């Protein structure tokens, strides 16, 4: 969230953070900002990306 990157440029996930914060700054229900929030958290941890790639690896191991 801070924006200070470890190599002296804008942090990797800072634009996602700022989109989420700007959404929540005027949407009275946080459920309206769910998509931007999960985009921010996906940028931090890559959970869904790695899960999908592991599904691909799983199917490869099944068909071999």
């Amino acid at each position: 969230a801070s924006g200070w990157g470890i190599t002296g440029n804008k942090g990797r996930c800072y634009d996602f953070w700022m989109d989420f914060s700007e959404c929540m700054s005027h949407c009275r229900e946080p459920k309206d900002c769910t998509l931007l929030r999960e985009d921010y958290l996906e940028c931090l941890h890559h959970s869904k990306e790695f899960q999908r790639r592991n599904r691909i690896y799983k199917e490869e191991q099944r068909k071999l």
Binding site: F16, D19, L35, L36, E59
Partner: protein
């Protein structure tokens, strides 16, 4: 001033290096998409190269190595 000379030199040749890298990555990504289409053939509900980000904005593929750039 010496450092600025080197740094300006890096700035003028940046676009051609980036364009080469972009072409390389696009070709590799097409090959990987064909690979995924083959492997996930006969897996119902799949979508080849689906963007996991809702915003759809482009991000480089995550690598699963904490600090690959320093080694």
């Amino acid at each position: 001033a010496l450092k600025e000379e080197k740094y300006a030199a890096r700035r003028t040749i940046l676009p051609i290096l980036q364009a080469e890298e972009d072409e390389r990555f696009v070709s590799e990504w097409k090959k990987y998409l064909e690979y995924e289409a083959d492997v996930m053939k006969d897996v119902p509900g799949w979508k080849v190269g689906e963007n996991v980000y809702n915003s759809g904005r482009w991000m480089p593929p995550a690598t699963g190595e904490l600090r690959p750039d320093v080694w």
